RNA sequence: GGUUGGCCUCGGAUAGCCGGUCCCCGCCGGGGGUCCGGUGCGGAGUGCCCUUCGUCCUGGGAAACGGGGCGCGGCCGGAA
RNA sequence: AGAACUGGCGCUGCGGGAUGAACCGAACGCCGGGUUAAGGCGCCCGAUGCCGACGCUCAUCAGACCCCAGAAAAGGUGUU
RNA sequence: CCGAGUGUUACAGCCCCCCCGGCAGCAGCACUCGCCGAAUCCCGGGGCCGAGGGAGCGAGACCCGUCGCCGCGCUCUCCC
């Protein structure tokens, strides 16, 4: 295989033309005028009997339902979720200290690390100043912040990631009896190793802050509109 | 009836020329953009290096 | 909660256009000391169509009828219920948040009034154009309460320029009580960021 | 703890002088006053938060009796800055004048 | 139904405001020189509570009024 | 009261003229978004809450928007 | 005498206007020239509303038409 050979300057558009492509492949000393299995028998395992047995796999359906509804049209590529893209607002980079707004901690001021594979975005106010842990949000329910802090060279972790943030249960009951699932009657214990994730990437946050004297009181609060607070006569 | 001037390949359906008719004028003004970061720095840092 | 507007100097329809959109809002507007409200024109020709008011009446009873209120709190009242949507529910529960209060009350005497630069003589009147008081037209028509009015304004500003006395008394020393110098930190953080 | 919605109160429905049209409202929140500065507002997930006689809630806390008609902002309005915006039921034409609750989600900036 | 409160001069507009020795008001303030500031910074486009997450170990600045309140008791203060 | 050329009400709602047969816009399936027409934008009442432009104008009977809803001659050292 | 202000006649001893030979490097630009603009024009980002509706000329197709026209990229040769 080889890259591109082709820079594109607008989506969708090539800097170099349709003959001179021509010249950069060199296609006229490559231009060429060159040149089922369903299954097997299986054993016999039979006397007053011969032949091994037929080729015959995934069968016919043993039932038809009454009506089906046509086949779809095709439409476009429409591609799915874990295809599609990544965007942020460019006031977010490595380090800028966000505002939670839809969660259950409404207003409290975190420290962005990593924007992940999904949209969602790992942002954690420090365990020592806040009670945010480790928590994915997303991208249009936060406000960010234009003071920033410099986590360059953080060195996150390598197996936190989505599949590491999801979520859990499994039916065993169908039946009307008098339990609520029997399960949910549980508080969770995932906790004894998000712990030790939390403190191989919380210990080199709190010396990246006190860099600058004012800010461990500034995550510590919350951000609340009272009485002179105007946003669009606010600068965040 | 999809846009042409608003979408791309329609208006190449309709127009093959319009896509080179495009790529020939980015060119001019991204190069005569480049024409005027350079000679107005030659003349921005030319009496900036005079006093 | 409430707003507390002061009434001298303004023109009467010029607040009233005003003072109506903010109670079909759902505010409560006070209108406080509205004998001193001027009113455009010279004085003879607003007392004209005053007195020319006041021959608007039903012939066959007027205790039916037009009831011409005489007190300058309720011909401003008046006013606002010509510039409200009064007949519908939406209406009638705008004045419900409108109380004019003729003088200053006690609830509001301690309360900080507004003023309007919307509505103000000072500000939308060519200065050799002649005015009329709602004070002394009011009072020329029927409002036989002027006099025992500004008799209690006196006892309401003898109170007041001894807490202004007092207040600046207080005052005087937040100026030179912030003299002493120990405390010159906590001013690098508000002279760079608006004292 | 702490308020984290602009205010803003319920105005009218957008009519012509004799017929209103239902089908979107308009606003005026607290803060604004001309239509060059009100771009900030634009897309904001505004709320009706009032009271009735049972519970239905949604989060983990218990029903009590509030409820909420949910609702975004559609567009400006105005030389003045006032908002119109469009909630997914028509508003009940009694909240006239009693406020509405802005909130800051579709946060851009 | 609401998501913090401003406890108050008078008024002037071809001007008003602050700070001020002296003489006139029963030992404080009405009356004039004198000194400030004025698109009002002694600025309700402001102001103070304040966004105080709780708590501990543990240091520095600030702090001699302690502050919640069934208090206990006295007082005089504010009639539109 | 009676005719000529065209249009309309009559059969026709809708936005406007405060209300209105005929006037100015515009002619109608049921609706979501967008934009305008005649019109308007202090408050009733959606919209000037623009730091609109230049003038005229004091009325002890001001004036205020086609048809359309109360006026002339003559006169004023009012004033431009 | 300094300094301010009146009334002067007076042509440079602040200045301006019209000429006759010149350069810088000029932007319809230091938001007055805001002109009229675009085969002389394209790029990016928000906001709102909606998602209506058995295409395989080919492999005798087989869980199951990412397919038609269109604009594309890479290989069926190499060096770097």
Redesign the pocket.
């Known amino acids: ?6 820079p594109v300057l ?5 800097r ?3 003959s001179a ?1 021509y010249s ?3 296609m006229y ?2 231009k ?1 005028s ?1 040149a ?1 299995l369903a299954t097997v028998t299986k054993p016999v395992g039979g006397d007053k009997n011969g032949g091994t047995r037929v080729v015959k796999l ?1 069968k016919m359906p043993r039932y038809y339902p009454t009506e ?1 509804v ?8 429409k591609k799915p979720f874990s295809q599609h893209v990544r ?1 942020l607002r460019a006031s977010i980079t490595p380090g800028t200290i966000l505002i939670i707004l839809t969660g259950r901690h409404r207003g ?1 001021r975190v420290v962005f690390l990593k924007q992940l594979a999904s949209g969602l975005l790992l942002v954690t106010g420090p365990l ?4 945010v842990p480790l928590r994915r949000t997303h991208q ?1 329910f936060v406000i960010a912040t234009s003071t920033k802090i410099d986590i360059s060279n953080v060195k996150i972790p390598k197996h936190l990631t989505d599949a590491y943030f999801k979520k859990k249960k499994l039916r065993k009951p169908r039946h009307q009896e008098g339990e609520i699932f029997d399960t949910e009657k549980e508080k969770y214990e995932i906790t004894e190793q998000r712990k030790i994730d939390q403190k191989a990437v919380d210990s080199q946050i709190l010396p990246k802050i006190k860099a600058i004297p004012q800010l461990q ?1 500034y995550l ?10 105007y946003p669009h006569k606010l600068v965040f | 009836k999809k846009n042409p001037l608003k979408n ?3 208006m ?2 309709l ?2 020329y ?2 080179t ?2 790529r020939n ?2 060119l ?2 991204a190069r005569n953009h480049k024409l ?1 970061v350079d ?2 720095a030659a ?1 921005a840092a030319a009496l900036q290096a005079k006093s | ?4 507007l ?1 009434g ?2 303004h023109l009467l ?2 607040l ?3 003072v ?3 109670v ?1 809002l ?1 505010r409560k507007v006070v209108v406080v ?1 509205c004998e ?1 409200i001027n009113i ?6 607003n007392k ?2 005053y007195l020319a008011f006041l021959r608007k009446r039903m012939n066959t009873n007027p205790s039916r009828g037009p009831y011409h209120f005489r007190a300058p709190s309720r011909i401003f009242w008046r006013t606002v219920r ?5 007949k ?1 529910k ?2 009638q529960a705008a004045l419900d948040r409108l109380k004019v ?6 609830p509001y ?6 003023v309007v630069p ?1 509505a ?3 500000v939308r009147l ?2 050799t ?2 005015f009329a008081y709602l004070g002394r037209l009011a009072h020329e028509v029927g409002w036989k309460y002027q006099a ?2 500004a008799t ?2 006196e ?3 003898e ?3 001894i ?3 007092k ?3 207080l ?2 020393l ?2 030179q009580a912030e003299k002493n110098v ?2 010159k930190i906590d001013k690098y953080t508000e002279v760079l960021k ?2 | ?3 984290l919605w602009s ?1 803003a ?1 319920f ?9 209103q ?4 409202a ?1 606003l ?1 929140i607290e803060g604004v ?3 060059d500065e009100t771009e900030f507002y ?2 904001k997930r505004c709320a009706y ?4 006689k049972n519970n239905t809630v949604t989060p983990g806390g218990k029903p009590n009796k ?1 409820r909420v008609i949910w609702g ?4 400006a ?6 908002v ?1 915006a ?1 909630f997914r039921s028509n508003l009940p034409a ?2 006239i ?4 609750r802005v909130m800051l989600y ?1 946060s ?1 900036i």
């Open positions: 295989p080889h890259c591109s050979r082709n607008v989506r969708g558009i090539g170099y033309s349709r492509m950069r492949k060199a000393k490559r060429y060159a089922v995934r089906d046509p086949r779809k049209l095709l439409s476009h590529g965007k409290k020592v100043l806040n009670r249009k009181g510590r609060s919350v951000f609340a509109l009272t009485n002179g607070i | 791309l390949r329609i190449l359906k127009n093959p319009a896509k008719m495009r004028t980015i001019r003004q005027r000679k107005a003349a | 909660q409430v707003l507390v002061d001298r100097g329809g010029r009233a256009a005003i109506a959109k903010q079909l759902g000391r001193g455009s024109g010279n004085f003879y020709r004209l169509k010509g510039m409200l949507p009064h519908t939406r209406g209060f003729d003088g200053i009350p006690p005497d301690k309360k900080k009034r507004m919307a103000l003589k000072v060519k200065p154009r002649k025992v009015t209690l304004e006892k309401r500003k109170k007041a320029k807490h202004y006395r207040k600046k008394q005052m005087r937040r100026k120990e405390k608006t004292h | 703890s702490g308020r205010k109160i105005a009218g429905y957008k009519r012509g002088l004799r017929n049209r239902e089908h979107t308009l005026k006053y001309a239509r634009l897309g938060v009032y009271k009735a509030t975004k902002v559609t567009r309005h105005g030389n003045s800055g006032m119109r469009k009694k909240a004048g009693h406020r509405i579709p851009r």
